[PDB]
Curated annotation (Swiss-Prot):
Transmembrane segments: none annotated. Belongs to the AB hydrolase superfamily. This is Leaf-branch compost cutinase. The disulfide bond between Cys-240 and Cys-257 contributes not only to the thermodynamic stability but also to the kinetic stability of the enzyme. InterPro entries: AB_hydrolase_fold, FrsA_esterase, PET_hydrolase/cutinase-like. GO terms for molecular function: acetylesterase activity; cutinase activity. It comes from Unknown prokaryotic organism. The gene encoding this enzyme comes from a leaf-branch compost metagenome. The source organism remains to be identified. However, it is presumably a thermophilic bacterium. The keyword Transmembrane helix does not apply. The engineered enzyme with mutations Ile-208/Cys-203/Cys-248/Gly-92 can hydrolyze PET in a highly efficient way, ultimately achieving, in less than 10 hours, a minimum of 90 per cent PET depolymerization into monomers, with a productivity of 16.7 grams of terephthalate per liter per hour. It was also shown that biologically recycled PET produced from enzymatically depolymerized PET waste exhibits the same properties as petrochemical PET, before being processed into bottles, thereby contributing towards the concept of a circular PET economy. Is inhibited in vitro by diethyl pNP-phosphate (E600), but not by EDTA. Optimum pH is 8.5 with pNP-butyrate as substrate. Shows 70% of the maximal activity at pH 7.0 and pH 9.5. Poly(ethylene terephthalate) binds at residues 60, 131, 155. Disulfide bonds join 240-257.
Length: 258
């Protein structure tokens, strides 16, 4: 009955590996686009179906390769994922938000036929690492049509975002670049009490946890994107009544479980 529902009923262990879809990549050259530095699109193959879109920003001095594992992971569970490069390696979080805005518009309007055919441009979300997570929160405030936002070990000088876009923030306990007490947790706490929000804190994790295969980041990011981009209530099970020994903190207003 849910026309956006993709793939078989999920199990926890299936969400810690690549999923039911084959994946192709498309390189968006820097010279071919304005408003962002290009990037890599991960999109499903072996399918005639359409999927939601995710634009994802790396952090300060990083490029799209720093989130390649998660682009491919997400695409393999049924998403079109554009991991950007930034115009400059030194772009701040609000510049990253602007480049996510350009990436979303690029996905909708000028992505190649191969990607457009797999994309439902009505269902878009954002995610990002560190300053890219900051950009994720800013664009969530500016664009109320986004289905979800997943800031990963996010960094921003702005601690206050006004959005109703559902937010799941991943903090890293041992993060020395974007300490959770100064970044992730203030972001979580200052989001509106009426916006569905989750904070998960990875035990023992560093700022670079998001840059390689991470079972917790995989489960929470797939689950949040499924729940909100696809309206796939089958993923509530991983986001609700959570007892996860990989986590050393969890905070929610439990507006996503019913
Ligand atoms: Ca603010």
């Amino acid at each position: 009955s849910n026309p956006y529902q993709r793939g078989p009923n999920p199990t926890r262990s299936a969400l810690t590996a690549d999923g039911p879809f084959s994946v192709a990549t498309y390189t968006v050259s820097r010279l071919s686009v304005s408003g962002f530095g290009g990037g890599v699109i991960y999109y499903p193959t072996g399918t005639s179906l359409t999927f939601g879109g995710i634009a994802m920003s790396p952090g300060y001095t990083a490029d799209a390769s720093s989130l390649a594992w998660l682009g491919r992971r997400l695409a393999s569970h049924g998403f079109v994922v554009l991991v950007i490069n930034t115009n400059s390696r030194f772009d701040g979080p609000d510049s990253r938000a602007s480049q996510l805005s350009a990436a979303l518009n690029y996905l909708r309007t000028s992505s190649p036929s191969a990607v457009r055919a797999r994309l439902d441009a009505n269902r878009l979300a954002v995610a990002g690492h560190a300053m890219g997570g900051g950009g994720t929160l800013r664009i969530a405030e500016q664009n109320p049509s986004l289905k979800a936002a997943v800031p990963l070990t996010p960094w921003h000088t702005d601690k206050t975002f006004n959005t109703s876009v559902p937010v799941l923030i991943v903090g890293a306990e041992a993060d020395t670049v974007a300490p959770v007490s100064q970044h992730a947790i203030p972001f979580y706490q200052n989001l509106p009490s009426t916006t569905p929000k989750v904070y998960v804190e990875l035990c023992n994790a560093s700022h670079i946890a998001p840059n390689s295969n991470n079972a917790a980041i995989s489960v929470y990011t797939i689950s949040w994107m499924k729940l909100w981009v696809d309206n796939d209530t089958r993923y509530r099970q991983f986001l609700c009544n959570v007892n996860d020994p990989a986590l050393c903190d969890f905070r929610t207003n439990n507006r996503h479980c019913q």
